[PDB]
Design a protein around this nucleic acid. Structure first.
Length: 183
DNA sequence: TAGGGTTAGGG
């Protein structure tokens, strides 16, 4: 079977009136849910405005994501691949971004190498293999931009990515200022 | 719009 983490979706922006039952009624349209829950304030019992839905298979998760936009209880919500508690500790881990930072790529890496691995996740809009300003030397990293934030999410929730024959690290791209705030 | 009494012992 597939790991519970990859079979789960974070549902943000829920109407304060959405309950486990109404959330389930909506999302069961795309598959068998093994878990469905609205997070609430431990004390006031009030809804925190987000919940989680888990399907029996990742294929059903993909169907749900392909069904966006989603409107639950009259409110447009935002379904996202669930980022593990461990990974949610990283700065910007929950940001909606369309660009990924690809690190540790060999110096002879070319755009076709990046496409052969990344296109499977979604439409690529931009690819930029970074080089040094002045020497023209390859720097060992690149940026890839997609047309859907879910393409980036589907990627970053995975541990390994093979480009030009070897593994490379992939993370959501952070702005110059985001980088500065994180360190 | 980031998790539900869900994260370092004791040899």
């Amino acid at each position: 079977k597939e790991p519970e983490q990859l079979r789960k979706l974070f549902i943000g922006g829920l109407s304060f009136e959405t309950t486990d039952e109404s959330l389930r009624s909506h999302f069961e349209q795309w598959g068998t849910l093994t878990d469905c829950v609205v997070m609430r304030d431990p004390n006031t019992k009030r809804s925190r405005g987000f919940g989680f839905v888990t399907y029996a298979t990742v294929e059903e998760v993909d169907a749900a994501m392909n069904a966006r936009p989603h409107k639950v209880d009259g409110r447009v919500v935002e379904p996202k691949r669930a980022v593990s508690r461990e990974d949610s500790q990283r700065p910007g881990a929950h940001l909606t971004v369309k660009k990924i930072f690809v690190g540790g790529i060999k110096e002879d890496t070319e755009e076709h190498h990046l496409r052969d691995y990344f296109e499977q996740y979604g439409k690529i809009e931009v690819i930029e293999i970074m080089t040094d300003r002045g020497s023209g030397k390859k720097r060992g990293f690149a940026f890839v931009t997609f047309d859907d934030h879910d393409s980036v999410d589907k990627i970053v929730i995975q541990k390994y990515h093979t480009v030009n024959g070897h593994n490379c690290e992939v993370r959501k791209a952070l702005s110059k200022q985001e980088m500065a705030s994180a360190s």
